[PDB]
Each structure stands twice: as C-alpha cells, then as structure tokens.
Enzyme design. Sequence first.
Site, PDB file in Angstrom:
ATOM      1  N   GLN A  62       0.839  -1.199   0.000  1.00  0.00           N
ATOM      2  CA  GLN A  62       0.000   0.000   0.000  1.00  0.00           C
ATOM      3  C   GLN A  62       0.873   1.247   0.000  1.00  0.00           C
ATOM      4  O   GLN A  62       1.817   1.355   0.790  1.00  0.00           O
ATOM      5  CB  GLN A  62      -0.936   0.040   1.216  1.00  0.00           C
ATOM      6  CG  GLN A  62      -1.991   1.158   1.148  1.00  0.00           C
ATOM      7  CD  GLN A  62      -2.950   1.046   2.324  1.00  0.00           C
ATOM      8  OE1 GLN A  62      -3.051  -0.026   2.936  1.00  0.00           O
ATOM      9  NE2 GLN A  62      -3.596   2.148   2.687  1.00  0.00           N
ATOM     10  N   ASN A 101      -9.162   2.896   0.672  1.00  0.00           N
ATOM     11  CA  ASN A 101     -10.221   3.814   1.064  1.00  0.00           C
ATOM     12  C   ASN A 101     -10.600   3.582   2.520  1.00  0.00           C
ATOM     13  O   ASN A 101     -10.209   2.588   3.139  1.00  0.00           O
ATOM     14  CB  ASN A 101     -11.454   3.724   0.138  1.00  0.00           C
ATOM     15  CG  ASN A 101     -12.184   2.418   0.267  1.00  0.00           C
ATOM     16  OD1 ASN A 101     -12.597   2.047   1.363  1.00  0.00           O
ATOM     17  ND2 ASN A 101     -12.371   1.713  -0.856  1.00  0.00           N
ATOM     18  N   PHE A 112      -3.277   0.243  -3.570  1.00  0.00           N
ATOM     19  CA  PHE A 112      -2.498  -0.928  -3.186  1.00  0.00           C
ATOM     20  C   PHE A 112      -2.257  -1.801  -4.406  1.00  0.00           C
ATOM     21  O   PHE A 112      -3.049  -1.791  -5.372  1.00  0.00           O
ATOM     22  CB  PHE A 112      -3.102  -1.721  -2.016  1.00  0.00           C
ATOM     23  CG  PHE A 112      -4.492  -2.251  -2.268  1.00  0.00           C
ATOM     24  CD1 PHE A 112      -5.574  -1.393  -2.227  1.00  0.00           C
ATOM     25  CD2 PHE A 112      -4.714  -3.608  -2.508  1.00  0.00           C
ATOM     26  CE1 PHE A 112      -6.875  -1.851  -2.437  1.00  0.00           C
ATOM     27  CE2 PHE A 112      -6.043  -4.087  -2.724  1.00  0.00           C
ATOM     28  CZ  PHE A 112      -7.114  -3.208  -2.676  1.00  0.00           C
ATOM     29  N   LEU A 121     -12.224  -8.134  -1.084  1.00  0.00           N
ATOM     30  CA  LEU A 121     -12.252  -6.702  -1.336  1.00  0.00           C
ATOM     31  C   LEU A 121     -13.090  -6.349  -2.559  1.00  0.00           C
ATOM     32  O   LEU A 121     -13.333  -5.168  -2.796  1.00  0.00           O
ATOM     33  CB  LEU A 121     -10.823  -6.149  -1.475  1.00  0.00           C
ATOM     34  CG  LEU A 121      -9.925  -6.391  -0.252  1.00  0.00           C
ATOM     35  CD1 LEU A 121      -8.502  -5.873  -0.566  1.00  0.00           C
ATOM     36  CD2 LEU A 121     -10.497  -5.747   1.019  1.00  0.00           C
ATOM     37  N   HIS A 125     -13.394  -1.992  -3.028  1.00  0.00           N
ATOM     38  CA  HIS A 125     -12.273  -1.194  -3.504  1.00  0.00           C
ATOM     39  C   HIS A 125     -12.300  -1.217  -5.018  1.00  0.00           C
ATOM     40  O   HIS A 125     -12.509  -2.281  -5.617  1.00  0.00           O
ATOM     41  CB  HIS A 125     -10.954  -1.788  -3.012  1.00  0.00           C
ATOM     42  CG  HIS A 125     -10.807  -1.722  -1.526  1.00  0.00           C
ATOM     43  ND1 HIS A 125     -10.114  -0.701  -0.906  1.00  0.00           N
ATOM     44  CD2 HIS A 125     -11.325  -2.491  -0.535  1.00  0.00           C
ATOM     45  CE1 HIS A 125     -10.200  -0.860   0.407  1.00  0.00           C
ATOM     46  NE2 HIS A 125     -10.913  -1.944   0.655  1.00  0.00           N
TER      47      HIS A 125
HETATM   48  C1  LIG Z   1      -7.241   6.746   4.414  1.00  0.00           C
HETATM   49  C2  LIG Z   1      -6.649   5.380   4.110  1.00  0.00           C
HETATM   50  C3  LIG Z   1      -6.676   5.079   2.610  1.00  0.00           C
HETATM   51  C4  LIG Z   1      -7.446   4.313   4.878  1.00  0.00           C
HETATM   52  N1  LIG Z   1      -7.407   4.381   6.320  1.00  0.00           N
HETATM   53  C5  LIG Z   1      -8.446   3.850   7.061  1.00  0.00           C
HETATM   54  O1  LIG Z   1      -9.476   3.398   6.548  1.00  0.00           O
HETATM   55  C6  LIG Z   1      -8.202   3.873   8.566  1.00  0.00           C
HETATM   56  C7  LIG Z   1      -7.439   2.579   8.716  1.00  0.00           C
HETATM   57  C8  LIG Z   1      -6.100   2.469   8.880  1.00  0.00           C
HETATM   58  C9  LIG Z   1      -5.377   1.185   8.936  1.00  0.00           C
HETATM   59  C10 LIG Z   1      -5.798   0.077   8.180  1.00  0.00           C
HETATM   60  C11 LIG Z   1      -5.067  -1.127   8.229  1.00  0.00           C
HETATM   61  C12 LIG Z   1      -5.464  -2.274   7.505  1.00  0.00           C
HETATM   62  C13 LIG Z   1      -4.748  -3.496   7.539  1.00  0.00           C
HETATM   63  C14 LIG Z   1      -3.605  -3.542   8.355  1.00  0.00           C
HETATM   64  C15 LIG Z   1      -3.219  -2.417   9.082  1.00  0.00           C
HETATM   65  C16 LIG Z   1      -3.938  -1.213   9.058  1.00  0.00           C
HETATM   66  C17 LIG Z   1      -3.600  -0.063   9.772  1.00  0.00           C
HETATM   67  N2  LIG Z   1      -4.265   1.117   9.712  1.00  0.00           N
HETATM   68  C18 LIG Z   1      -5.180  -4.726   6.721  1.00  0.00           C
HETATM   69  C19 LIG Z   1      -6.211  -5.562   7.467  1.00  0.00           C
HETATM   70  O2  LIG Z   1      -5.832  -4.208   5.539  1.00  0.00           O
HETATM   71  C20 LIG Z   1      -5.035  -3.548   4.643  1.00  0.00           C
HETATM   72  O3  LIG Z   1      -3.824  -3.438   4.699  1.00  0.00           O
HETATM   73  C21 LIG Z   1      -5.898  -3.011   3.517  1.00  0.00           C
HETATM   74  C22 LIG Z   1      -5.547  -3.655   2.171  1.00  0.00           C
HETATM   75  C23 LIG Z   1      -6.316  -2.884   1.068  1.00  0.00           C
HETATM   76  C24 LIG Z   1      -5.915  -1.424   1.171  1.00  0.00           C
HETATM   77  N3  LIG Z   1      -6.265  -0.911   2.491  1.00  0.00           N
HETATM   78  N4  LIG Z   1      -5.548  -1.574   3.541  1.00  0.00           N
HETATM   79  C25 LIG Z   1      -7.122   0.137   2.773  1.00  0.00           C
HETATM   80  O4  LIG Z   1      -7.753   0.703   1.882  1.00  0.00           O
HETATM   81  C26 LIG Z   1      -7.331   0.516   4.239  1.00  0.00           C
HETATM   82  C27 LIG Z   1      -8.331  -0.400   4.926  1.00  0.00           C
HETATM   83  N5  LIG Z   1      -7.695   1.934   4.404  1.00  0.00           N
HETATM   84  C28 LIG Z   1      -6.784   2.945   4.668  1.00  0.00           C
HETATM   85  O5  LIG Z   1      -5.559   2.769   4.738  1.00  0.00           O
END
Ligand SMILES: CC(C)[C@@H]1NC(=O)C/C=C/c2cc3cc(ccc3cn2)[C@@H](C)OC(=O)[C@@H]2CCCN(N2)C(=O)[C@H](C)NC1=O
Length: 163
Positions: A62, A101, A112, A121, A125
């Site tokens: 990501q 998102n 990502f 997803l 997404h």
């Molecule tokens: C403003 C940000 C674009 C938004 N931010 C929030 O929604 C607030 C959340 C933050 C966050 C999410 C996390 C999620 C994971 C692991 C560690 C995390 C740590 N912190 C694993 C399960 O999932 C992922 O890695 C997933 C994989 C697909 C891409 N993807 N991530 C997102 O689109 C995440 C859901 N969205 C954000 O990053």
Amino acid sequence: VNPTVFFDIAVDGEPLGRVSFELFADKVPKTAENFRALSTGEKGFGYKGSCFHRIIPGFMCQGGDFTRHNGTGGKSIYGEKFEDENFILKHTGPGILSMANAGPNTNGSQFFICTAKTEWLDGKHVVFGKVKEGMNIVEAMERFGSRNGKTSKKITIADCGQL
Ligand SMILES: CC(C)[C@@H]1NC(=O)C/C=C/c2cc3cc(ccc3cn2)[C@@H](C)OC(=O)[C@@H]2CCCN(N2)C(=O)[C@H](C)NC1=O
C-alpha cells in the site's frame, strides 16, 4: 489507448527496479486518470518521492500517501475525496492495482498492489489497473514487508511518470 505509468522503486535510497502498470481507462476512466496525473505530477502534486507505508507479504503493498507518508494523508486530483466509480473489475490475483479507502466514496491518492488474490475486497475497492512489467520488483519489495505491514527498509517511488 489505456495509459501506462511507471514507478522507479528505491530501497533506503538505493535503486531496486521499475514497475509499470496498465491503467484501465476503458473501464474506470475517472479513477485511471487520477492515478495517471498523480504519476506524472502534472497538477503540481503526486507520487514522486512518496513511500509505501504498509507491505504485508502474501497480501498487498500500500502506498500513495504523498502528504503524510503514513497512511493518514493523500488527496485526489478532484479534491480530497472522490466517489467509487464502479466495481466492474475484481481482485483476481497478484498484480491487481486498486484504490485504498476508508469507507464508501472516499478515494483519494492511496492505492495498493495485490500480491495475492484478495477477493473479499471485491465490490468495496475500485480496481483500476494491473502491473504489466516489473512484478518481480513488486515481489522484491514484498521481502521488505512484515506480517504487521511495517517495512524493514524505506520503500520509495524515486521517480514516476507516463510511458
Ligand atoms: C485513508 C486510508 C486510505 C485508509 N485508512 C483507514 O481506513 C483507517 C485505517 C487504517 C489502517 C488500516 C489497516 C489495515 C490493515 C492492516 C493495518 C492497518 C492499519 N491502519 C489490513 C487488514 O488491511 C489492509 O492493509 C488493507 C488492504 C487494502 C488497502 N487498504 N488496507 C485500505 O484501503 C485501508 C483499509 N484503508 C486505509 O488505509
């Protein structure tokens, strides 16, 4: 017709290799255009110099938070957020390029690259591209990830643009 963009990836400032993507402007033109313009920098901001803040091997890499470098920032060429354009394309396997998102209709600049099929997803997404060349470089990037996603070296987009 579909545009091609490249990232030149560095690891602790040392060049690693180039990843190129096809952007599916034929199916998601608004989303593809955002990524294209952030990759060229033509609006005055974009991906050049930004990092991959979360790399989970066997899942995805990501990046795209060019304002806060940690997943809390970024913005689109249309404003802070824009809508989910459609969900025509699915997360079918490694190489899929998709928008990150925080809920419905919150796309910004974060994205990502899948390193596995992430079918759960689908419909949540917006998939808008795929790695063309350089999947081997994405695989090399994956070795700097961890189970919790923290990278063990700084993974940066040293240069980017349109081919
Ligand atoms: C403003 C940000 C674009 C938004 N931010 C929030 O929604 C607030 C959340 C933050 C966050 C999410 C996390 C999620 C994971 C692991 C560690 C995390 C740590 N912190 C694993 C399960 O999932 C992922 O890695 C997933 C994989 C697909 C891409 N993807 N991530 C997102 O689109 C995440 C859901 N969205 C954000 O990053």
